Design a protein around this ligand. Structure first.
Ligand code: HEM
Ligand code: HEM
Ligand code: 332
Ligand code: 332
Ligand code: H4B
Ligand code: H4B
Lengths: 421, 421
């Protein structure tokens, strides 16, 4: 009937029934849980070489259409019935179908609403949709993307947006962004053997270089867009610098913080995921929202395999960086998080602290259970990378399932691509 | 063949094969993950009213015996074969069997080694075992427990120990400790409506009172031991105060911290779990190790439903406790964690910071994969309640499964107990 869920901070109980609408299998087996796996098959939708079998497509198409018309406060059975028939006919005559802009807008928001790992979902209905389903070349992809970046950045007043490129046809003409994020810094292995920039993008940086991109050997070089249009080999496009808004990192007290020469970009945008809806698949649909402070202050700056600045900040603060029990790491990361927030704020760039975001998500989750008896949530991703139990989300039990529409991961494009030359 | 596991901080890969030895089902379904559920049935072993069916017991008994003799570096097939036969005969003639002290010692350590939620498992082979399987009355239970507490506390130099009471027979003569922990503070609802003490023990405190315990209405009143022996109604036993070592909370810089009038006990001991081994069940087997600083500094002191001192410390530090984005909560909890560590250290009481414990667990996990191709681990419990990604455990993918021997949760005793009077 329903899965009982409890919040141990308030004692409040919630009943989940939405999980019944969950899709196929999902990560965990029976005798073992695989909850902490970053990229499980259950969250990945791979490549195809043939259209989607009609026996599978039709049912899903009907389901989505029913969900769409069911969302209206004041039903429209005539339109609903008409659309149902039109979709079927289109599927029979073309072997697939096109969504209306309206249905697409609905699908992108629902997919967001259904993202288990997203803590900013209280904003789910506030999303600008750019329809690029008529895109044809890489150059056009590049133009659409530049327009998306410009719109979303809005000189610091960040706006959530998503650009939808052509849906997968036979799977041999996929539109794909080989980048992970629209804006990301390069990483290089210098002659002296040290790593400069974002150590996590060493391979991808080399790929861009192999494709002709000119390496700049800087600590914060914005990687180029690697765009694959209509199944053709990817083409490199440098992002126009004017479109990349950045924030110089400063601390409200430590004047030496700026001396670290750090900065980060204002726009967090996923470039490599796939939108699944009503049987259709969109391999190219970059989307963005705004940053949560910890992503930069904690992961980007403090992960040992990223910029790894924790120790340096420790010494600057003159802490016992040689004695773990001193908890110097905790004191350092806090000042770094303060720097990030202080800087975005001073430069008028939208950002949200993890505390405010956690409370925000709690309100959302409660709205969702009230609205539809459930909220797919991945505790492991929702709990911030610092001060876990200090946030309310930590004490909230959650159920993680895959609904539809949904945003899936994909297999790295360079692993399955069939080069033309 | 094996489940691939990855550490994204080092890129290291591990192959898990041990999960094949996992037991029945476990929390997660197929279409949904229930990883963040605190007390799932998969981790609970409830009450019985009849002995264990021989068809089930024998197989498990044989399995355990094989595991025990298999653990020796220099095998002893003759003893192994002899024991196998002796156990079978005992099962046929008595309908159950008794473990040797040696096998029991092995079982308690393996069960610990198999605790997915324990971060201190690198110490798994260092455990003192107290055999109280011949215990008969509550008074004797009380004496054994006092001896355990005294031994473990060791004037601050904490030692890990476990006391094993009689195994479950027909399920109608269960030995049970109604407390959750051996040492825990009471919580009271005062006449003025405020809560004093540990708000989380309000109900259990009332229960002790209902059973005759005299409430002291203090902020740190050690709850009495509620002991159920041989299936009989529980009897209340106050813990002799000399046996409870406590640490007064002080901060190395903030002289006003001591003014908060806080303290905590030195001994963390689970009192209500069940030890399962070779088909046998031990409903009463309290065990202890030593504290990890965050348990007290973060959960006990900062959980809103516990002592909830975060805001007060915030004001004392003169922080913008009215502006979440100031990250005052992060600064407060850090100083509290420093206080806890500083105090235990100053009073010579064993304790370990969460950073040192995380690295310690990483070494353990690596020893385990090398030793037996696996390590049941619950990411959600292993990652400290503060500074998550700052610890290495956060970047380590893990598989959570239930092996055997194992420590299970139980249904609250007052929910199934059949009162004699
Ligand atoms: C409005 C502001 C938003 C905020 C503050 C927010 C914040 C976050 C954060 C902190 C994460 C964790 C990312 C990581 O750990 O790498 C995340 C993940 C995610 N978000 Fe949101 N989000 C927002 C908007 C959106 C929008 C507009 C979409 C899509 C339409 C979306 C889709 C997702 C998805 C799919 C993930 C998972 C990403 C992955 O698996 O790597 N979010 N978000
Ligand atoms: C030697 C020092 C040890 C340390 C530092 C340690 C630390 C911890 C910590 C921090 C937790 C989390 C508890 C919570 O969040 O409430 C935990 C859980 C656990 N530990 Fe250990 N532990 C140690 C020894 C042991 C021993 C001796 C046993 C048993 C023989 C054991 C069994 C467990 C079990 C079963 C859990 C799960 C408890 C639950 O589900 O509530 N640990 N331990
Ligand atoms: N706030 C968000 N954060 C992320 C995407 O942004 C980035 C930017 C850089 C990096 C990552 C993610 C992943 N770690 C390596 C570097 C996840 O998805 C979304 C979607 C809308 S807002 C948003
Ligand atoms: N270090 C440990 N911590 C815990 C048990 O100790 C306590 C003490 C008090 C409280 C809890 C746990 C649970 N939260 C409420 C109050 C879990 O189990 C063990 C086992 C050996 S060491 C150990
Ligand atoms: C192994 C683990 O799954 C991985 O480190 C984690 C946990 N949670 C996360 N949570 C978020 N939000 N983003 C993340 O990258 C990760 N990675
Ligand atoms: C809902 C969630 O499962 C519960 O808050 C958590 C997460 N992890 C924990 N981790 C530990 N070690 N101890 C805990 O009590 C909890 N509770």
């Amino acid at each position: 009937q329903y899965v009982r869920i409890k919040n141990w901070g308030s004692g409040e109980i919630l009943h989940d029934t939405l999980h019944h609408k969950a899709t196929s299998d999902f990560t965990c087996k029976s005798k073992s849980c695989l909850g902490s796996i970053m990229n499980p098959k259950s969250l990945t939708r791979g490549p195809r070489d043939k259209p989607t079998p009609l026996e599978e497509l039709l049912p899903h198409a009907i389901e989505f259409i029913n969900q769409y018309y069911g969302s209206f406060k004041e039903a429209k059975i005539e339109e609903h019935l008409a659309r149902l028939e039109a979709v079927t006919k289109e599927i029979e005559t073309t072997g697939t179908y096109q969504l209306t802009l309206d249905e697409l807008i609905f699908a992108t928001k629902m997919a967001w609403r259904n993202a288990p790992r997203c803590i900013g979902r209280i904003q789910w209905s506030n999303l600008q949709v750019f329809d690029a389903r008529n895109c044809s070349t890489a150059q056009e992809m590049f133009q659409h993307i530049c327009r998306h970046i410009l719109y979303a950045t809005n000189n610091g007043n960040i706006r959530s947006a998503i650009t939808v490129f052509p849906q997968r046809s036979d799977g041999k003409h996929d539109f794909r962004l080989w980048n992970s994020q629209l804006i990301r810094y390069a990483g290089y292995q210098m002659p002296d053997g040290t790593i400069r920039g974002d150590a996590a993008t060493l391979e991808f940086t080399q790929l861009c270089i192999d494709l002709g991109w000119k390496p700049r050997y800087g600590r914060f070089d914005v990687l180029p867009l690697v765009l694959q249009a209509d199944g053709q080999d990817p083409e490199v496009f440098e992002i126009p610098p004017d479109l990349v808004l950045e924030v110089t990192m400063e601390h409200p007290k430590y004047e030496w913080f700026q001396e670290l020469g750090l900065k980060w970009y204002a726009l967090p945008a996923v470039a490599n995921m796939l939108l699944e809806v009503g049987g259709l698949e969109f391999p190219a649909c970059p989307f963005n929202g705004w940053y949560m402070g910890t992503e930069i202050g904690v992961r980007d700056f403090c992960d040992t395999q990223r910029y790894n600045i924790l120790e340096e900040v420790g010494r600057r603060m003159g802490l016992e960086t040689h004695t773990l029990a001193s908890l110097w790491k905790d004191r350092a990361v806090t000042e770094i998080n303060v720097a990030v927030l202080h800087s975005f704020q001073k430069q008028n760039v939208t950002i949200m602290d993890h505390h405010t975001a956690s409370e925000s998500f709690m309100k959302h989750m409660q709205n969702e259970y009230r609205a539809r008896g459930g909220c797919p949530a991945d505790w492991i991703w929702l709990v911030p990378p610092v001060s876990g139990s200090i946030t309310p989300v930590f004490h909230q039990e959650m159920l993680n399932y895959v609904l539809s529409p949904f945003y899936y991961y994909q297999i790295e494009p360079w692993k399955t691509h069939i080069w033309q030359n």
